[PDB]
Amino acid sequence: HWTSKVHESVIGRNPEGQLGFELKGGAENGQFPYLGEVKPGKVAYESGSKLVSEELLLEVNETPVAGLTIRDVLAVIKHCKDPLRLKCVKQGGIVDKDLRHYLNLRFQKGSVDHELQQIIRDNLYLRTVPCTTRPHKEGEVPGVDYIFITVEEFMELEKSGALLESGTYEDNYYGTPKPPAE
């Protein structure tokens, strides 16, 4: 399963209040939060397993953070007292930092992988406004319910890799652009 190798690694802050690794990725790059280079001298381990480089960050103190921007992940961590309980999973095989692709995967309904995928999708949806080519309907605030764009624009976001989800419903395009880094 996708969540087979998920493990928890409990760490503390170092001097300068850092983690001994940098957070990369985030929804703004269309990615899972993931660990930069984990160097031995700098991670203040407490308990659980060890962190390696490139691991996908899933949860901080039971708060799911996959699907969020780096900025939001940093914000969860800052409102968490030590020690930080990190649920992570190594990249490799079908486990990858690419959020677009992860959201295309199709797991069994009822599966832990499916449950998790839905949590990650909702996180993504909390930080983004979808875009569509269908006309503004009454009741809708442009830029909140939907960024209303032309097909040429949708096609251009598409080709540029700006979209994490996309598709047509009734002769019109619908997608989710990457949130901005803030």
Binding site: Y125, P130, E165, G167, Y169, Y174, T176
Partner: peptide, 13 residues
């Protein structure tokens, strides 16, 4: 949350 039109377009049924 996202509307049915968006999900019918972006998610496999």
């Amino acid at each position: 949350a996202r509307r049915e039109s968006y999900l019918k377009a972006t998610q496999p049924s």
